[PDB]
Protein backbone atom coordinates (compact mmCIF):
# COMPACT_ATOMS: atom_id res chain seq x y z
CA UNK A 1 0.00 0.00 0.00
CA UNK A 2 2.37 2.79 1.22
CA UNK A 3 5.70 3.67 -0.31
CA UNK A 4 8.42 4.42 2.25
CA UNK A 5 11.06 6.93 1.14
CA UNK A 6 13.68 8.36 3.52
CA UNK A 7 14.40 11.91 2.39
CA UNK A 8 16.96 12.90 5.03
CA UNK A 9 18.39 10.92 7.95
CA UNK A 10 20.99 11.31 10.72
CA UNK A 11 20.15 8.01 12.37
CA UNK A 12 21.31 4.38 12.40
CA UNK A 13 19.82 1.86 9.95
CA UNK A 14 18.01 -0.07 12.67
CA UNK A 15 16.43 3.08 14.07
CA UNK A 16 15.41 4.23 10.56
CA UNK A 17 13.63 0.94 9.87
CA UNK A 18 12.01 1.15 13.31
CA UNK A 19 10.71 4.68 12.58
CA UNK A 20 9.10 3.35 9.37
CA UNK A 21 7.60 0.23 11.08
CA UNK A 22 6.33 2.45 13.91
CA UNK A 23 4.67 4.95 11.52
CA UNK A 24 3.17 2.05 9.54
CA UNK A 25 1.58 0.65 12.73
CA UNK A 26 0.35 4.18 13.70
CA UNK A 27 -1.33 4.62 10.29
CA UNK A 28 -3.07 1.26 10.47
CA UNK A 29 -4.68 2.43 13.75
CA UNK A 30 -5.15 6.22 13.32
CA UNK A 31 -6.17 8.61 10.53
CA UNK A 32 -5.58 11.97 12.24
CA UNK A 33 -2.07 13.36 11.82
CA UNK A 34 -1.75 14.48 15.46
CA UNK A 35 -2.68 10.95 16.70
CA UNK A 36 -0.21 9.29 14.32
CA UNK A 37 2.45 11.71 15.62
CA UNK A 38 1.58 11.01 19.27
CA UNK A 39 1.91 7.24 18.76
CA UNK A 40 5.34 7.53 17.11
CA UNK A 41 6.62 10.07 19.67
CA UNK A 42 5.49 7.96 22.64
CA UNK A 43 6.97 4.75 21.19
CA UNK A 44 10.29 6.44 20.52
CA UNK A 45 10.36 7.95 24.06
CA UNK A 46 9.73 4.44 25.39
CA UNK A 47 12.27 2.53 23.27
CA UNK A 48 15.05 5.12 22.82
CA UNK A 49 14.55 7.42 25.84
CA UNK A 50 13.00 10.93 25.91
CA UNK A 51 12.64 13.46 24.53
CA UNK A 52 11.31 12.94 20.99
CA UNK A 53 9.16 15.24 18.86
CA UNK A 54 7.07 14.21 15.88
CA UNK A 55 5.39 16.08 13.03
CA UNK A 56 3.15 14.36 10.54
CA UNK A 57 1.54 15.95 7.51
CA UNK A 58 1.04 16.61 3.84
CA UNK A 59 2.15 20.30 3.79
CA UNK A 60 4.78 21.78 6.12
CA UNK A 61 8.33 23.07 6.33
CA UNK A 62 10.45 23.09 9.43
CA UNK A 63 13.69 24.20 10.94
CA UNK A 64 14.66 22.16 14.00
CA UNK A 65 17.76 21.40 16.09
CA UNK A 66 18.37 17.67 16.78
CA UNK A 67 20.82 15.63 18.84
CA UNK A 68 23.39 13.97 16.51
CA UNK A 69 22.16 10.53 15.24
CA UNK A 70 18.58 11.31 16.29
CA UNK A 71 16.88 12.68 13.16
CA UNK A 72 14.75 11.33 10.34
CA UNK A 73 12.55 12.90 7.69
CA UNK A 74 10.61 10.44 5.51
CA UNK A 75 7.47 9.85 3.49
CA UNK A 76 4.95 7.11 3.97
CA UNK A 77 2.83 7.57 0.84
CA UNK A 78 1.94 11.29 0.59
CA UNK A 79 2.39 11.80 4.34
CA UNK A 80 5.67 13.30 5.53
CA UNK A 81 7.01 12.42 8.98
CA UNK A 82 9.61 14.34 10.90
CA UNK A 83 10.96 12.65 14.03
CA UNK A 84 13.86 13.96 16.08
CA UNK A 85 15.29 14.29 19.57
CA UNK A 86 16.07 17.54 21.33
Amino acid sequence: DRKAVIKNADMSEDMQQDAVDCATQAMEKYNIEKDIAAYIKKEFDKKYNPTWHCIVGRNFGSYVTHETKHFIYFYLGQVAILLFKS
Binding site: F60, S62, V64, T65, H66
Partner: peptide, 9 residues
Protein backbone atom coordinates in the same frame (compact mmCIF):
# COMPACT_ATOMS: atom_id res chain seq x y z
CA UNK B 1 23.42 19.50 18.21
CA UNK B 2 22.79 20.18 14.45
CA UNK B 3 20.21 22.18 12.46
CA UNK B 4 17.99 20.67 9.81
CA UNK B 5 15.49 22.05 7.29
CA UNK B 6 12.69 20.02 5.70
CA UNK B 7 10.03 21.01 3.11
CA UNK B 8 7.19 18.94 1.54
CA UNK B 9 7.09 19.35 -2.32
Amino acid sequence: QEDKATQTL
